[PDB]
């Protein structure tokens, strides 16, 4: 399956894609301000992620460090990245389907548009000013928008046993963003798709 990933945003983001045991494609890649770059994932991939990373400094090896959404200090991630993190989440061929969701469960650093470039369903998209309205206690100082999971560590925000309820740290990022998920449990917004469809994904779509 292809994904264009466009960054649409002023500022360069490293786009950094993983299944979190395995990178997808070369796993991560610079994107000035309007450069797009194309990835290919298997198809089959189960649990894959791409998301933008900020403020990051790569040595010649692509070794070094990001803000948001660090993999290791690696480029080419092959881990899942540091929250806080807007994440566009897929499974794809899965029982002959592709599901595909926006999440802030780890929190928000960059907005985004996850939608198909082929036929058979829609996008998802989380485009507000989350991290300029976020709420005093969840800012992360290395910017973005924390999760309360990441903040607090109790098993309601992490949803640990399974059982948790809304929260209002959830509830502000489910009022921004009513079309990702705000915390474990939340009612899916989780978009089935014709399995082997192709995506884009936009940071700073609007």
């Given at each position: 399956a292809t994904f264009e990933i466009v960054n649409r945003c002023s500022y360069t983001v490293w786009a950094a894609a993983s299944?979190?045991?395995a990178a997808?494609?070369?796993g991560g890649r610079q994107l000035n301000s309007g450069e797009s770059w194309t990835i290919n994932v298997e198809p089959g991939t189960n649990?894959?992620?791409?998301w933008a990373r900020t403020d990051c400094?790569?040595?010649d090896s692509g070794?070094?460090?990001?803000?948001?959404?660090?993999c290791g200090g690696?480029?080419?991630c092959k881990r899942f990245g540091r929250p806080p993190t807007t994440l566009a989440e897929f499974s794809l061929n899965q029982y002959g389907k592709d599901y595909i969701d926006i999440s802030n469960i780890?929190?928000?650093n960059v907005p985004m548009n996850f939608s198909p470039t082929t036929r058979g369903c829609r996008g998802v998209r989380c485009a507000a000013d989350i991290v300029g309205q976020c709420p005093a206690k969840l800012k992360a100082p290395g910017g973005g928008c924390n999760d309360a999971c990441t903040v607090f560590q109790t098993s309601e925000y992490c949803c640990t046993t399974g059982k948790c309820g809304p929260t209002e740290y959830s509830r502000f990022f489910k009022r921004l963003c009513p079309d990702a998920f705000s915390y474990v449990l939340d009612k899916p917004t989780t978009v089935t798709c014709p399995g082997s469809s192709?995506?884009?994904?936009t940071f700073c779509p609007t």
């Open positions: 299944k979190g045991d997808l494609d070369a649990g894959g992620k791409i400094y790569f040595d070794s070094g460090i990001c803000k948001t959404g660090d690696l480029l080419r780890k929190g928000f192709n995506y884009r994904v």
